[PDB]
Amino acid sequence: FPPQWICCDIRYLDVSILGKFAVVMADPPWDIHMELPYGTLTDDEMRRLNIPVLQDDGFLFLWVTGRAMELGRECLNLWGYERVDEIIWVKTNQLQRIIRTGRTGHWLNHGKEHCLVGVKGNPQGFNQGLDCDVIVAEVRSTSHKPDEIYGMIERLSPGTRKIELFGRPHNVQPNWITLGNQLDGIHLLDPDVVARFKQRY
């Protein structure tokens, strides 16, 4: 299926209309207890996200930073996953070098972003160990995660439907439904999703 998306608030959308997905990915605006130029979700709001209905067997990719290294582990276990891997995106500059300077963390400088990998139930037809748990990529977009993750997930789970939470316009992909409050309207093509969407809204 071509890309599909729903401009919405993730706290409030009835996600049961969306069906089940082999992969769930979220890059949420964690409350990391610092002043930030964007709005965050409280810890309670994050815990209460209705992730568990999105999936019965499959994987979760949950980007984490700061205190959400621990809160994200708590959410992963709350949502019924076992953490089985941890990917890091190593950020390079235009010349494939680490930017070592500035003050980019509280104690040490930060050269990477982390993504917890969780597994739920008993998934079928995935390809283990094709990719490494280190991504090397320059900062390209206003997104805090690299586009390479989409190819890794496809090679892991080819042809299956997948859902992304807190996605932005440039994140829409084939085989993915993208949810976020900055997308352009609603664009649904799967016949079963449109059906339930009409019934619910």
């Binding site: 994987f59 290294m69 621990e70 582990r73 076992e82 953490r83 089985v84 891997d85 941890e86 990917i87 890091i88 190593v90 390079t92 010349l95 494939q96 070098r97 680490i98 070592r100 300077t101 500035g102 003050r103 980019t104 963390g105 509280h106 104690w107 040490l108 400088n109 930060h110 050269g111 990477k112 982390h114 990998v117 597994v119 995935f126 283990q128 160990g129 094709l130 990719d131 490494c132 748990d133 280190v134 991504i135 090397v136 990529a137 390479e148 190819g151 890794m152 090679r155 892991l156």
Partner: protein, 276 residues
């Protein structure tokens, strides 16, 4: 350009393509970055204790025999995980948790715990809690395979090409206020070296540099170190050491009056180091 796809095609890990990761070549073209590191390493060297070391079977050792309290503790317990998965005592996370690290840590202090890349990322956090630390950074040792391209835990979904050294903080430290205990942001939370040979269990020596640059406390303990890791400025404790020169009275005397347990700082390093 997608280095993930390139790894799938050729077996060269994406980290193989990061440039200038060595201790020397990273600041070759950045004289004033290199100067900060040079001056700080000189300050470390000027204030370093001579190497001290104690052979001890840590599982059956009363850790309280190590005095005085430590400003930084580096742990490298040989993980039974590693020897089971690949083929002295090997340690489960229950074994590691039983260590009484909190009995020898200074009231303000840091820990650096090598956790591997599997269950240790979660259980190492539990250990930090038990010993009274908060997880505050995660130093990833990213391993290249430039000399040996290709593929290489049953629960894993991806090939594991790094190890995590979790960093924890104990007590109250304030980066702007406590400039006499820490120099924050001098190093980044990544170490990049070539995969060691199978069975070579050494950790990258750069982890010492990160710790020494970061914390000005001079009381530095390396648990599970070896002959090959003894280092000025450090007390090394482990079962495989072939001699022992540790005397707790002598070791403590290096930090008591007229000395300080802190390195202090020069006016030039204060003018060069990153600050708010």
């Amino acid at each position: 350009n997608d280095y993930c796809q390139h790894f799938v095609d050729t077996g060269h890990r994406p980290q193989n393509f990061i440039r200038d990761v060595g201790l020397a070549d990273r600041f070759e073209e950045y004289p004033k970055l290199r100067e900060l590191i040079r001056l700080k390493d000189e300050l470390i060297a000027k204030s370093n204790t001579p190497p001290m070391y104690l052979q001890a079977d840590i599982e059956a050792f009363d850790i309280r025999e190590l005095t005085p309290k430590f400003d930084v503790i580096l742990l490298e317990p040989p993980l039974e995980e590693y020897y089971r998965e690949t083929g002295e005592k090997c340690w489960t996370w229950d074994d590691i948790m039983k260590l009484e690290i909190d009995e020898i840590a200074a009231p303000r202090s840091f820990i650096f715990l090598w956790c591997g890349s599997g269950e240790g990322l979660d259980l190492g956090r539990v250990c930090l809690r038990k010993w009274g630390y908060r997880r505050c950074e995660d130093i990833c040792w990213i391993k290249t395979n430039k000399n040996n391209p290709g593929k290489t835990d049953p629960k894993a979904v991806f090939q594991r090409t790094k190890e995590h050294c979790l960093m924890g903080i104990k007590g109250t430290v304030k980066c702007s206020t406590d400039g006499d205990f820490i120099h924050a942001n001098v190093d980044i939370d990544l170490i990049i070296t070539e995969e060691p040979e199978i069975g070579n269990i050494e950790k990258p020596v750069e982890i010492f540099h990160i710790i020494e640059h970061f914390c000005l406390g001079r009381r530095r303990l390396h648990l599970f170190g070896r002959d090959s890791t003894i280092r000025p400025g450090w007390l090394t404790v482990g079962p495989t050491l072939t001699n022992s020169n540790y005397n707790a009275e002598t070791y403590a005397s290096y930090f008591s009056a007229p000395n300080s347990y802190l390195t202090g700082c020069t006016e030039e390093i204060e003018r060069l180091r990153p600050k708010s």
